[PDB]
Amino acid sequence: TPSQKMKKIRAGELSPSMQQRTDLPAKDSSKSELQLAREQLHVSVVPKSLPCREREFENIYAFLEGKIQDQCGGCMYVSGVPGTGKTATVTGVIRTLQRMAKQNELPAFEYLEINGMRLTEPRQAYVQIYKQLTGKTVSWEQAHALLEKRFTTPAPRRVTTVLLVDELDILCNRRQDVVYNLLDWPTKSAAKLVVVTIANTMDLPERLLRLTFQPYSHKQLQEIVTARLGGSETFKGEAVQLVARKVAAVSGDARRALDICRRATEIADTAAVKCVTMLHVQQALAEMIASAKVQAIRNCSRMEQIFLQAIAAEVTRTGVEETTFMGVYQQVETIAAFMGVTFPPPGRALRLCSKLGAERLIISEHSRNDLFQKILLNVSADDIHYALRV
């Protein structure tokens, strides 16, 4: 019955599950060396020992060990550009500490975790912390009182519990109350809490209320993929350098280097060659790091090409970038007079403006205020002539 099952979910005794595959999973022996190279190159498969992160690993390990043996607790704030492997490092060091606790070299502890964007309202986080405590579920105000009752009361034995915090910035409110309580909770010496928050901007507590994972350079981003590949020589040794040069400057994501190599491995599968070539990596970088705004302007119909020339001529003639539609239509009638092809009457030109605005070649207003709607140019003006002649 539905009532017994919703009570089974709310007390948590029913395990969530997905339907299993009816067909068995495919056997490992049939996989090609390129296919195994692709499967080891997926972003999900985090190595047990992370290449080129050993300094931050030993820092977090010595810190959390010296805070979890001495029973004192506190706060720590790691931060950096996304793609720097923060959460993989902190989850890896907590995994090593729990593996240590199974061998009883360390006092036992419960590892809690949250994630700010897996919540709805920020106050719902008060339910989730308690959901990984006793496992009981309750409304957030009673959850607030019970988190207080586990935290305000000096009642030994109080086991230390770490609190990893994904995405602290999404927990901000107009009151900023939840993040403020999550920071104030370690200050109680009786409830031996320690919190490890993970964030992107480096100065958030100053901005609206340490450790910094710097982005990978060319050699670290070489080292990550060349340890990920294993002993197969499916990649030539310069293709990883080419990926590291074209990714280490732009953003430094580890995920971008990995799926660029994976998509290049897929293009090598399309070429039916067992080893990649550097032009495969050139094709993968040309596809995944691109805008087709040149190809879009090349493949618009001729009246939108006339319209796109006319907005650029209007930014030249009036000298401002945002234009009223009537001056664009006057420049349109000039260019259509020069080319010798007639232009559609202005309602169809409003349709062309709305269609190019849907494609974000230009930023246009709703067409209820025709011949007074503002028009910006979104594509850069040189790309128009570069797509139209070349």
Binding site: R351, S354, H366, S367, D370
Partner: protein
């Protein structure tokens, strides 16, 4: 497709072409329908009666489930979904319960049936010009509802605006535009002359006068009366319902000197030029100090901010201390400032003799800006009924 247009042509003369177009697009129901049909024309073109006659004729004659709607009723989208599903899924009862566009799409998706009964759907949204003012996901869904629900529908829309006003920043799918031209004068004469039998049978209802009504209210006499009427009002309006509504009353005042004994254009061209003055309008005092306050309000809102030192772009807004100063200057008796006089200020506010533009939160601070709203003629009537001329200032 033949029976529907053949049954709607006699009711709707001078409109054979638009009926031919709609009866080819959504006439037969075994055929598929286009995803949306946007027909439009001026006020009084005859489209609400046209689509309503088309939906009731198709839903009585054939397999379709029809639904009419008026978009001004739908001040929130769930009321629109309730009316649409309440007509499209008959006898649902009070088990109907739609919350958003997804639930309406699923409950319309379940209504799909086998092709062998060849069902269709139709939806008409009158006054669709309001549809762009509301939630602004309703128009893109309403155009491609056939693709979305995988049914066999066709969402008609109706407005006076051309379709090019309707576009938004995300764009819309395909639509079938359709224009209805307003009538030229010969066709408006044909429309007003089609009802000659009904107006003769009405005139027979109200015996020498009935003896001359039955002998001299014939067809060509009514055609000459219609030419004599459209010689006058056609330049002022082509709106066919107003021409019917005024043409019957002017026939009632026209018929007197053929009830007794051209030979008529003078007798009716008298009253017709008074009848033009009362087009569109459809019909069938002040306290003394409020008079002086309305006079001083017109002086404060017309005689500028700097002419008033020597007397003492549209109308100009003014603070009320300027109004009390002009009231003191024009009063020549100097009344004490009782509560009743400031109450008279607030009653000229409430009766739309004055208006507010700003300062509403601090009217007692005197910083509020007011705006007198009266033309020259009535304030001259006020200065006449007082006898105090206002043209000197």
């Amino acid at each position: 497709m033949e029976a529907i247009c053949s049954s709607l042509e006699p009711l709707f003369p001078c409109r054979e072409a638009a009926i031919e177009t709609l009866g080819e697009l959504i006439g037969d129901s075994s055929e598929t329908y286009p995803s949306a049909i946007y027909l439009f024309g001026h006020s009084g073109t005859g489209k609400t009666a046209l689509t309503r006659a088309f939906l009731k004729e198709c839903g009585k004659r054939q397999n379709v489930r029809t639904a009419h709607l008026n978009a001004i009723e739908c001040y929130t989208t769930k009321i629109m979904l309730e009316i649409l599903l309440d007509s499209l899924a008959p006898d649902q009862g009070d088990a109907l319960k739609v919350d958003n566009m997804l639930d309406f799409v699923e409950q319309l998706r379940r209504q799909a049936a086998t092709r062998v009964e060849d069902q269709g759907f139709l939806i008409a949204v009158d006054n669709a010009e309001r549809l762009r003012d509301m939630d602004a996901n309703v128009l893109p869904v309403l155009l491609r509802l056939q693709e979305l629900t995988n049914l066999n529908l066709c969402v008609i829309l109706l407005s006076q605006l051309p379709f090019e006003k309707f576009y938004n920043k995300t764009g819309l799918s395909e639509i079938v535009c359709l224009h209805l031209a307003q009538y030229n004068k010969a066709e408006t004469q044909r429309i007003l002359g089609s009802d000659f039998q009904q107006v003769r049978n009405q005139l027979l209802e109200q015996k020498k006068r009935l003896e001359i009504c039955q002998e001299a209210v014939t067809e060509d006499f009514y055609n000459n009366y219609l030419n004599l009427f459209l010689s006058v009002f056609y330049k002022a309006c082509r709106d066919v319902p107003e021409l019917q509504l005024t043409a019957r009353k002017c026939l009632s005042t026209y018929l007197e000197p053929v009830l007794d004994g051209s030979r008529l254009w003078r007798h009716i061209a008298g009253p017709l030029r008074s009848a033009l003055t009362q087009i569109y309008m459809r019909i069938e005092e002040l306290p003394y100090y409020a008079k002086f306050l309305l006079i001083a309000a017109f002086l404060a809102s017309h005689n500028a901010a700097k002419q008033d030192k020597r007397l003492f772009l549209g109308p100009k807004s003014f603070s009320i201390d300027r109004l009390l100063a002009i009231f003191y200057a024009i009063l020549e008796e100097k009344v004490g400032l009782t509560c009743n006089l400031l109450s008279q200020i607030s009653t000229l506010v409430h009766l739309n003799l004055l208006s507010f533009v700003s300062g509403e939160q601090n009217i007692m601070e005197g910083s509020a800006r007011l705006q007198c709203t009266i033309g020259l003629e009535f304030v001259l009537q006020i200065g006449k009924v007082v006898g105090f001329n206002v043209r000197q200032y």
